[PDB]
Amino acid sequence: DPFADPLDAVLAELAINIQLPPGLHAKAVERYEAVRRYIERPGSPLEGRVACFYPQGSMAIDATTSTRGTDDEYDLDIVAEIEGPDLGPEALLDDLEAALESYPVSKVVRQTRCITLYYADGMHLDITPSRRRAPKEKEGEIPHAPARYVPMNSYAFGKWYCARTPTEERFALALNRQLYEQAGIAFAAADVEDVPPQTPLIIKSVTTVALQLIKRHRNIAYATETGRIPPSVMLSCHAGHAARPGMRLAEMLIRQARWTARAIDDAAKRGQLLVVPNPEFPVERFTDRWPESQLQQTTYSRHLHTLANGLEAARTLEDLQEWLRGQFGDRVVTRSVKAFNQ
Numbered sequence: 001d002p003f004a005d006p007l008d009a010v011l012a013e014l015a016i017n018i019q020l021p022p023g024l025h026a027k028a029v030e031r032y033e034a035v036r037r038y039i040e041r042p043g044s045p046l047e048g049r050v051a052c053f054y055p056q057g058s059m060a061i062d063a064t065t066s067t068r069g070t071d072d073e074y075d076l077d078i079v080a081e082i083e084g085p086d087l088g089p090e091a092l093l094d095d096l097e098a099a100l101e102s103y104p105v106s107k108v109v110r111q112t113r114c115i116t117l118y119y120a121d122g123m124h125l126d127i128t129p130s131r132r133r134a135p136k137e138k139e140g141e142i143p144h145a146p147a148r149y150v151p152m153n154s155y156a157f158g159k160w161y162c163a164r165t166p167t168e169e170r171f172a173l174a175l176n177r178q179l180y181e182q183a184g185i186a187f188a189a190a191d192v193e194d195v196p197p198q199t200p201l202i203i204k205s206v207t208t209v210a211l212q213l214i215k216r217h218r219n220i221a222y223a224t225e226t227g228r229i230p231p232s233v234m235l236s237c238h239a240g241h242a243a244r245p246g247m248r249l250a251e252m253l254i255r256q257a258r259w260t261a262r263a264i265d266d267a268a269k270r271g272q273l274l275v276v277p278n279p280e281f282p283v284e285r286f287t288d289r290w291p292e293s294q295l296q297q298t299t300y301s302r303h304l305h306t307l308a309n310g311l312e313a314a315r316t317l318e319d320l321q322e323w324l325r326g327q328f329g330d331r332v333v334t335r336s337v338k339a340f341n342q
């Protein structure tokens, strides 16, 4: 039972408290499908020009957390694959921004590579337009606007990650029952095969839960950083590489922290920067924007060693709760320790 051991159990409670809550989780797909419907409407510049709409990033791998700087807002990443004449990356973003004009949300913000839709309830959407470039699903490019195209295959990365993280029945059933119970909902499933469709699995894998805690640790250590932060797709890639069936949560969290820290250390030893290719599309590097310098990567490695070393000292819990507050956030740790008390 993932709640039997005290350290594994408090980490599980922490992970439950950073998930996309069930009520919002149940709205996410319809939300982005409504965006697609809007940009496909008559008069839109992108009328007839949308090939497909798909989640990328955390939503593609059931890894969504509260967004950096907050405990109660969430960002979802959606790709709009666009067809027709290619007149450059800036014009592609221009078309997407124009198609999203007057969309009834709190605010629409044009970013360097995407258009952001901020929603009143705190679950936001980043819409990245893409151009398909090759037959493989879904090998192509995204705009950066000098303006340039950037190769990517986030679709195949998501599928690759999911293949490495098959649902772990005992773990998933236990953590989902608690996630839903905290939200006032009866999650009633004896087996992962016949979960009631009204209460689907949100949590599926110890590997992903550890990855969510890695991202939370990152979000706390860089909560107010306005510069570049360690990228989640690099962390998600390493989590996929580190995936091991049947591992306990603390053990896996230590393993993933040391995976990234040691990879950084080995590059730094050579005066080189961390390099992490897309397993499904090796010309794409998940390290193309980060790290920019030795200081950046070695700073993050030091944070990761501190996390791994403290969790390992705990395996070998009132002093631990204070240390956890510094690593994962005061309020979320307080809420989790309360649940573990009962």
Ligand SMILES: Nc1nc2c(ncn2[C@@H]2O[C@H](COP(=O)(O)OP(=O)(O)OP(=O)(O)O)[C@@H](O)[C@H]2O)c(=O)[nH]1
Binding pocket: 056, 057, 058, 059, 063, 064, 065, 075, 077, 154, 215, 231, 232, 233, 236, 284, 285, 286, 287, 288, 289, 290
């Ligand atoms: N190659 C590359 N892709 C990126 C980079 N940043 C974002 N992406 C792509 O955009 C997707 C969404 O980015 P993120 O929001 O940072 O990833 P995430 O897994 O959703 O992480 P969280 O939002 O922190 O939960 C990623 O899965 C990547 O496909 C980057 O620096 N390099």
Ligand SMILES: [Mg+2]
Binding pocket: 057, 058, 075, 076, 077
């Ligand atoms: Mg994201």
